[PDB]
Amino acid sequence: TKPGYINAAFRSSKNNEAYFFINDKYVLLDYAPGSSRDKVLYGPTPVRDGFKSLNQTIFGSYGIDCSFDTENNEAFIFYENFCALIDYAPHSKKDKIILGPKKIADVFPFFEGTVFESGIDAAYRSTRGKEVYLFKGDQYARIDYGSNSMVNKEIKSISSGYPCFRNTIFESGADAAFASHKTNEVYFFKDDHYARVKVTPXXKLXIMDGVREIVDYWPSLKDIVPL
Amino acid sequence: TKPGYINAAFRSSKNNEAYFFINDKYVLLDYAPGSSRDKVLYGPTPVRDGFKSLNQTIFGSYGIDCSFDTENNEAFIFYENFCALIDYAPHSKKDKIILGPKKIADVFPFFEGTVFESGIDAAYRSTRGKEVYLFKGDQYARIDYGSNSMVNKEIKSISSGYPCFRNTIFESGADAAFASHKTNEVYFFKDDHYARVKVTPXXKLXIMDGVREIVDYWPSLKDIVPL
Ligand SMILES: [Ca+2]
Ligand SMILES: [Ca+2]
Ligand SMILES: [Cl-]
Ligand SMILES: [Cl-]
Ligand code: NA
Ligand code: NA
């Protein structure tokens, strides 16, 4: 990810809302999926100011570079080789850390000695059980955070797993991502571009309307992107 | 540093007291300098329990691998490539972070592109002004935290700065160190050994009574080191 662009994202338990992490700040967006009533609810503002529990930690100093909602008001956040499980309390505004900060390889042992050990580019919550897809360069992992294991017991290339990404900028990786409130729809970001994808746990599907520009799709981000 | 051995140390504002950092825990010690009557004041205890402002940080998780006092009830602490200025508030147990957690080359930018950038081995407070000696492998630096600069133009080898360490387990580095309450005496740790040294911001040091065993010098730490 380059300066100013979306480096992390996750879906809120609050309907039709998502947190986007850029540099060392965040934006809370009502990304209005399936309509055009998008609006920025909060931000741009420092992670250290927004989520005070993160203020005097690595996440509050440097921001957050990968994430994904788990369940309820919880989400895993990453910065380089460290990660944390947080409660981002969207109603009470009373964020707390639940786990860590801990090295990725240690919260997720199966990642030790892989490309994810030193860091993760992007991730999103599967609709399926406790499954998660994570991306590092052109590689991706599918995990189960309840069993804390790799579902596909093998780390495979993105094109092997996302044919819709072949001959696109996403074939080689993503800046950030997040699962929509819209069942089985996923957003992938990369530079000033986004891909709205429809997935299905049976390997093969589609990009909806090709690769477009983030600010064309969400005019409310017009001069927030790049930051 | 091998597991169970002293990984960091700094001198307390309270007379003849010091904090020794071992694994993910620490000991508070009346180390009794120039006299005897050593006594363990607290611990061993997880850093995350004794210092709660650090509980949910990389320090609470992994411990401290390098440190040095500055002035008052403050100190710089380290863990790999991250550091933080803390208030250990010895009178009240109400430690708080004052700065960081943050990358070393970030707080001390002259360490950028240096052997110090990825981590520091040991450090001690100079009696002179706001100077500090830091060691990594077999070399060391002399910085000033007031001007936040390097006093010594160049990173020098240990044997060059410390003749007394020639042909000693210390010329290849140390695990930990701290300045004594007793003027210009410094303690250096390596495995089960230690050198009590008489420095003098200059050229000619001397190891008082040779290299000895930590537990023979501090009988109180005898069922504790190694941990
Ligand atoms: Ca990223
Ligand atoms: Ca050390
Ligand atoms: Cl993400
Ligand atoms: Cl030290
Ligand atoms: Na997601
Ligand atoms: Na010291």
Q: Give the A window 88-107 contacts with B, CB below 8 Å.
A: 97, 100-102
Architecture of domain B1-227: 4 Propeller (2.110)
Residue in A53, A58, A102 nearest the CB of B101: A58
Assigned token pair, B193:
């050994």
**Ligand 4: distance of its center to the CA of A56 in Å?**
23
| List of residues 6+ apart from A140 with CB closer than 8 A | A133, A134, A155, A156, A157, A158, A161, A162
Q: How close, in Å, is residue B104 to chain A by CA atoms?
A: 12
Phi, psi of A143 (to 5 degrees): -120, 175
Question: What is the chain A residue with the closest CA to B48?
Answer: A100
Q: Tell me how far apart the alpha carbons of residues B163 and B145 are, in angstroms, rounded to a whole number.
A: 26
What residues contact residue A187 under an 8 Å CB cut-off, 6+ apart? A9, A124, A177, A178, A179, A180, A194, A195, A196, A197
Contact residues on chain A for B103, CB-CB shorter than 8 A? 62
CB A26 within 8 A of CB A43: yes
Structure solved via: X-ray
Contacts of B58 in chain A (CB under 8 A): 57-58, 82, 101
Token code pair at residue A72: 């309820």
Q: Is B107 helix (H, G, I), strand (E, B) or coil?
A: helix
Task: Find chain A residues with C-beta within 8 A of B57's C-beta.
Answer: 56-58, 101
Spatial distance between the Cα atoms of B46 and B23, rounded to a whole number of angstroms: 9
CA–CA dist B218, A157 (Å, integer)? 57
Q: Which residue has the tokens 């210390």?
A: B170
Please check whether residue A44 is in contact with residue A224, taking contact to mean a CB–CB distance below 8 angstroms.
yes
Resolution in units of Å:
2.2
**Residue A160 C-alpha to ligand 5 middle, in angstroms?**
21
Query: What is residue B207's DSSP assignment?
Result: B
Distance CA A43, CA A62 (A): 17
Characterize the bridge pairing of strands B139-144 and B156-157.
Answer: antiparallel
Q: Nearest Cβ partner of B58 from A53, A62, A82?
A: A82
Q: Which amino acid is at B7?
A: N
Breaks (C-N over 2.5 A) in chain A follow: none
Chain B interface includes A63 (CB < 8 A): no
Q: Are A181 and A11 in contact (CB under 8 A)?
A: yes
C-alpha to C-alpha distance for B161 and A138, rounded to whole angstroms:
49
